[PDB]
């Protein structure tokens, strides 16, 4: 492939460099339309800018935490982090979010990876070996209440059991209602005068539930869960302007008030170098 062809002096009536940008086109002008060039080859394919590659590496999408401790006398397991759910979403952490929102609709399979590490912040004789259970409680399913509900039987709901310190990995097909995931949605769930606005009203993929299967030892053990997400088989439509201001909420486009100028001011003139 040639990156530049050889081109010499020109004295024409045919001027490729004068255009009318009002038309909305970006005319494909090249170095050889306005200087004299020599042949050179590309030596490159643009492999690593493919959208599959761009969205295809694992990104941290969520960090939560649960603890193993005596539940005796706990009136609210959920509240003691005896167990914890995660109303699943990808808008939480901003790194991957800015990348996805370069597109309007996106479609891809997900390959999640869950790392769990334990901490024992206060005096323990040892480090116990805990098994985590991660169970996907899709919408319309019983929601745990206690850390050892009938729920956790999860006879019809996919669940994975792995050890703290290890990692669990499993992918799931693209479970969108539509043909693709909306990255934006300028609508409502119905014509209500007070119903929410935006994506949130589409993001309804349930929540992920985590718990330790082990009963309690004499000390307490903090287990912190990190969920990583990798898109595989990516398809993206309609590019948009990149995010400039900071994010404030999962699912709304809102930016913070009295934010700071995002364009760097010159130290000098327009004329400055």
């Amino acid at each position: 492939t040639v990156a530049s062809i050889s081109s010499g002096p020109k004295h024409t009536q045919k001027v490729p460099i004068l255009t009318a940008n009002e038309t909305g086109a970006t005319m494909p002008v090249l170095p050889s339309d306005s200087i004299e060039t020599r042949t050179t080859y590309m030596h490159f394919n643009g492999s690593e800018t493919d959208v599959e590659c761009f969205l295809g590496r694992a990104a941290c999408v969520h960090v939560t935490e649960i603890q193993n401790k005596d539940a005796t006398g706990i009136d609210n397991h959920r509240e003691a982090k005896l167990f914890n759910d995660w109303k699943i979403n990808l808008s939480s952490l901003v790194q991957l979010r800015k990348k996805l929102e370069l597109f309007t609709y996106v479609r891809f399979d997900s390959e999640y990876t869950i790392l769990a590490t334990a901490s024992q912040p206060d005096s323990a004789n040892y480090s116990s070996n805990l098994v985590v259970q991660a169970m996907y409680v899709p919408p319309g399913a019983p929601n745990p209440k206690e850390w050892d509900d009938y729920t956790w039987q999860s006879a019809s709901n996919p669940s994975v059991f792995f050890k703290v310190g290890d990692t669990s990995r499993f992918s799931v097909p693209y479970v969108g209602l539509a043909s693709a995931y909306n990255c934006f949605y300028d609508g409502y769930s119905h014509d209500d005068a007070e119903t929410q606005y935006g994506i949130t009203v589409l993001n309804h993929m349930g929540s992920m539930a985590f718990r330790i299967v082990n009963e309690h030892d004499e000390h307490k053990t903090l287990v912190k869960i990190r969920v990583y997400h990798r898109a595989k088989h990516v398809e993206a439509w309609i590019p948009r302007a990149p995010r400039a201001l900071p994010y404030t909420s999962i699912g709304r486009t809102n930016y913070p008030k009295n934010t700071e100028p995002v364009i760097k001011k010159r130290k000098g003139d327009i004329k400055s170098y």
């Binding site: 899709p138 919408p139 319309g140 019809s156 209602l177 349930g206």
Partner: protein, 59 residues
């Protein structure tokens, strides 16, 4: 107020004109539908799509 054979019966009144016999929304996973076999199976899945057949037999 307690489950009875009678909640399967939609009553009809002689001589009423213009009026309404019954009403329900179509949340097949809840409400009237929920205990029916259809309702009961739909509940093992997250998403449904398709046509429903609703019939009335007169007695």
């Amino acid at each position: 107020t307690k489950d009875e054979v009678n909640s399967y019966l939609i009553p009809l009144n002689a001589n009423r004109q213009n009026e309404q016999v019954f009403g329900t929304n179509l949340f097949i996973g809840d409400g009237v539908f929920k205990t029916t076999l259809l309702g009961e199976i739909v509940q093992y899945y997250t998403h449904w799509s398709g046509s429903l057949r609703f019939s009335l037999m007169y007695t």
